[PDB]
Amino acid sequence: RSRKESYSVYVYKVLKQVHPDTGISSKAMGIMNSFVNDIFERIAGEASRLAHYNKRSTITSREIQTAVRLLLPGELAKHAVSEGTKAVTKYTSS
Template sequence: MPAKVKKSRKGPLPTGPPKLKTTAKSATKKKPRSKKRKESFKIFIFRVMKQVHPELTVSTRAMGIINSFVIDIFERLASEASKLAKLGRRATMSSRDIQTAVRLILPGELSKHAVSEGTKAVAKYTSGI
């Protein structure tokens, strides 16, 4: 009986882990993208409305308009307070800068009420700490 002869491999030896065959189905399977988070004040607007008028409801369109209004006012106040802090050559905005920005941006009686409510909120916050 003739002896078995080993056949030698031609070419370089493979390195690394063996390659897996991919099918068309597994190649197209991807993780679903998560939705981009959209920040809004809608929840807080709704909570305040329910405190003031529990019997009322608000439509989605109206809530969107109120949310846009709040964001616009917030941006205006932040921008003005930032300018005031820069004029004073300070790196940090203070409650005084916010108060001055409110007086500059909001008209007449509305600014007075906003300042008094803001002062009351700051006092409540500092007493709670």
């Protein structure tokens, strides 16, 4: 067989973190994986476009931040930016 791959494990872990007792079916898990892949594709494309605009040959955390700003509507953008910045700050300290 091949090795199709998905974020199922991490989706299940986040599902347990948010609702410790509420499970999820296989169809729902696949839909969530597809959503994650589509959001990844969109954010990465926007970051690459920002890099090409700024003539930067690299996609940095700032590019990802601006791509998230250019896509998420308002409060969602403000929360995702805070999450990303906190994650990067905690990563830089280890």
